[PDB]
């Protein structure tokens, strides 16, 4: 690739990201004072474990749908084979949502935007997965310290998705080229903006993997106690990724 081609890739990755966010960042920043009252927090804590799990799996499904759309807009992704597109979204969709999450997090009061207002960790106490919630809030807190611009999140999340080391890849070399080009775009943009200092501070790659394993372990626990809740009231896309639908979303 040449220099005008690296810069063109930067702009298309940033444009693809802005167009595939479930929530506008302007809306998220203007809502920061709209915080759940102690009575509203108590209502969430008093909801049944299964009711909280259904709501959260539904919110994760909506966010993963926007990540599927982001992947379809990344140059090179639809040029990969269907097996590879599916391998990458199955391994990387949750990881992308985990990074995106920091836009809806407020490190000033340790709250997250959930169902119209901001609330802390204690809002998810009914889920019965305290350590997973803690890890999610800590990971968001650690990304907030980086003060990412939207362009930085866009370039980083494209790299979280386009990972050539994913087990199951048929055309490994084609994914390596796409990843190398997105790496040049990310590093070029960081070099240009005098932001290469964030490289050393980016979360290690076993951290995203650990967060994803915790999610699948806690879901197995919930599913064992409530198998009919999962079968009857969990979204089909959630069950395909974590317990088909990807083939339809990708063709569309
Ligand atoms: C804001 C939204 C839209 C943005 C955009 O695109 O604009 C991109 C980010 C996206 C987002 O942050 N999210 C999408 C849904 C949401 S959540 O908001 O429901 C929420 C629940 C629990 C929590 F700790 C914190 C938040 C979510 C849902 C369920 C789980 C579970 F693993 C867990 F942890 F609950 F167990 C699980 F297991 F339920 F799946 C984790 C998360 C973390 C990411 C969150």
Swiss-Prot record:
Induction: Up-regulated in the state of obesity.
Effect of residue 133 to N: Nearly abolishes transcriptional activity
Source domain of life: Eukaryota
Motif AF-2 in this chain: 237-242
Tissue specificity of this protein: Isoform 1 is widely expressed in many tissues, including liver and adipose, and highly expressed in skeletal muscle. Isoform 2 is primarily expressed in immature thymocytes.
Location(s), subcellular: Nucleus
Residue ranges constituting the NR LBD domain according to the UniProt record: 5-243
Family statement drawn from the similarity comment of this UniProt entry: Belongs to the nuclear hormone receptor family. NR1 subfamily.
Role this protein plays: Nuclear receptor that binds DNA as a monomer to ROR response elements (RORE) containing a single core motif half-site 5'-AGGTCA-3' preceded by a short A-T-rich sequence. Key regulator of cellular differentiation, immunity, peripheral circadian rhythm as well as lipid, steroid, xenobiotics and glucose metabolism. Considered to have intrinsic transcriptional activity, have some natural ligands like oxysterols that act as agonists (25-hydroxycholesterol) or inverse agonists (7-oxygenated sterols), enhancing or repressing the transcriptional activity, respectively.
Disease note: Immunodeficiency 42: An autosomal recessive primary immunodeficiency characterized by increased susceptibility to concomitant candidiasis and mycobacteriosis. Candidiasis is characterized by persistent and/or recurrent infections of the skin, nails and mucous membranes caused by organisms of the genus Candida. Mycobacteriosis is characterized by infections caused by moderately virulent mycobacterial species, such as Bacillus Calmette-Guerin (BCG) vaccine, environmental non-tuberculous mycobacteria, and by the more virulent Mycobacterium tuberculosis.
Domain notes: The AF-2 (activation function-2) motif is required for recruiting coregulators containing LXXLL motifs such as NCOA1 and NCOA2.
Subunit structure: Interacts (via AF-2 motif) with the coactivator NCOA2 (via LXXLL motif). Interacts with the corepressor NCOR1. Interacts with CRY1. Interacts (via AF-2 motif) with the coactivators NCOA1 and PPARGC1A (via LXXLL motif). Interacts (via AF-2 motif) with PROX1. Interacts with FOXP3. Interacts with NR0B2.
UniProt-recorded name of the protein: Nuclear receptor ROR-gamma
Source organism of this protein record: Homo sapiens
Taxonomic path: Eukaryota, Metazoa, Chordata, Craniata, Vertebrata
Gene coding for it: RORC
Span within the parent record: 265 to 507 of 518
């Amino acid at each position: 690739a040449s220099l005008t081609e690296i810069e063109h890739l930067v702009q298309s990755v940033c444009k693809s990201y802005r167009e595939t966010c479930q929530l506008r960042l302007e809306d998220l920043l203007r809502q920061r004072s709209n915080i759940f009252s102690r009575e509203e927090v108590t209502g969430y804590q008093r909801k049944s474990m299964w009711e909280m799990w259904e709501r959260c799996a539904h919110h994760l499904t909506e966010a993963i749908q926007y990540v599927v759309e982001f992947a379809k807009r990344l140059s090179g992704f639809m040029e990969l084979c269907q097996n590879d597109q599916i391998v990458l979204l199955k391994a990387g969709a949750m990881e992308v949502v985990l990074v995106r999450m920091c836009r809806a997090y407020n490190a000033d009061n340790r709250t997250v935007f959930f169902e119209g207002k901001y609330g802390g960790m204690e809002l998810f106490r009914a889920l019965g997965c305290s350590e997973l919630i803690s890890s999610i809030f800590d990971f968001s807190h650690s990304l907030s310290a980086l003060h990412f611009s939207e362009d930085e999140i866009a370039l980083y999340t494209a790299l979280v998705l386009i990972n050539a080391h994913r087990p199951g890849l048929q055309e490994k070399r084609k994914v390596e080229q796409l990843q190398y080009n997105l790496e040049l775009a990310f590093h070029h943009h960081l070099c240009k903006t005098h932001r290469q200092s964030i490289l050393a501070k980016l979360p290690p790659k076993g951290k995203l993997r650990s967060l994803c394993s915790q999610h699948v372990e806690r879901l197995q626990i919930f599913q064992h106690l409530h198998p009919i809740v999962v079968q009857a009231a969990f979204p089909p896309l959630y069950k395909e990724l974590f317990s088909k639908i990807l083939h339809r979303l990708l063709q569309e």
